[PDB]
Amino acid sequence: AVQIGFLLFPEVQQLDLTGPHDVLASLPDVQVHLIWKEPGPVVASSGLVLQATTSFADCPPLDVICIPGGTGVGALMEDPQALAFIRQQAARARYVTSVCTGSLVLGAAGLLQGKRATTHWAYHELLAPLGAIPVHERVVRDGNLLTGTGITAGIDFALTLAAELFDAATAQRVQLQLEYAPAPPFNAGSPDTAPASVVQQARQRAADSLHKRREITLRAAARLAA
Amino acid sequence: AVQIGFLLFPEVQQLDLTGPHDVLASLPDVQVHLIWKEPGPVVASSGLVLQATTSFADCPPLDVICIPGGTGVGALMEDPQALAFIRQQAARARYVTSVCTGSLVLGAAGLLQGKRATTHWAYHELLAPLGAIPVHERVVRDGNLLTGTGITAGIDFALTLAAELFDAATAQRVQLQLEYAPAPPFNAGSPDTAPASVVQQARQRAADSLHKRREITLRAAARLAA
Ligand SMILES: [Cl-]
Ligand SMILES: [Cl-]
Predict the structure, then answer these.
(1) Is B189 touching A (CB cutoff 8 A)?
(2) Domain CATH for A108
(3) Most-buried pick from A88, B82, B134, B219 (CB within 10 A)?
(4) Contact B180 A50 (CB under 8 A)
(5) Which residues constitute the domain of residue B188?
(6) Which residue among A14, A182, A206 places its CB closest to the CB of B152?
(7) Could you give the number of structural domains in chain B?
(8) Long-range pairs, A165-168, Cβ under 8 A, ≥24
């Protein structure tokens, strides 16, 4: 069975994880794990309570690892146990993936050095100090690394992984069974298409978080420099 | 505070619920409830464990009620306690909504009689015996009833509800904060765009479920006829 693992941490943005989970769990001969330091409840940033199924020590070797984003990324960027686990699994995984600010965790773990990558638009400046080549595209692939932007990035790239792990007809069948054909009623999902007034509001609301994450990023970069 | 409730039941398709939950939970002055017969664990069809936060008896009057779909819809269509709760909340709710096969639950509760509605493509024939006017569109609005198709229908219609409960700039800001701009890598999300061979496979895999749901639908229709 293909082994797929998602890191589940306090203050995760749960949709970053639950989207790809439901798609990939629809495939035959997959096993999906929700990984944290021990099994048990983990609370997402919205208050939704999710259950981790396996610990770092008991997790099998993964074929796919996926790091979601969320408020909780700041703590993960300085969690040596989590970063060590990610590095160990990435060494042999067929696919290393992240959604939104999850790529900052890959960066803190050293896995973006010299690699093309993206992250959430408001935090994109933090990729370069972590050694990445920043790219402003919604899905960026460099070798076996896939990084994507948007809360539903993992739904789309899960269909790509289904086609490469199985075949295109399997991916299309899953898409059809889920009737997945999005049609947003607004076109404000990028700073290049949203009204300027909306961009300003969103940037102002992210400013305190960005300031705190600049500090964390510099400390994480210092650890990589040693 | 605006009160938004999702029905959480065993064998739910969790993305039908977790998508709109994360969008709506991003809004100011909202309170979101996960409703079942009692608080506690509820297992989704994928095995993901979610927690219900409130019981039918303790749930406040809702401004928005949302019924997700999933395998578990068949049991809900004949659960008199759940159907009675839905009817009570729908009487005063500003918005009554469903995702995918959740509209079959609204149908069993009597809430689609004489109303335009949609559901998952493989189960669309079951709307007419429940009194609905079936429509083949991704989002169908009839008064305060919204029914949508696709596992991520509730993400899109949550942005519509944000614009009508608050204003368009608020909805656009949420879309931008989430960087929501989907771009599926295949175009097989509808039976009209997927290859014929894929449609056949999907229909064959749904056949046993459809047969069982034809039986349940007829019994539910008989209860409405009395
Ligand atoms: Cl997206
Ligand atoms: Cl969809």
Answers:
(1) yes
(2) 3.40.50.880
(3) B82
(4) no
(5) 1-226
(6) A182
(7) 1
(8) A165/A2, A165/A27, A165/A63, A165/A94, A166/A27, A166/A28, A168/B186
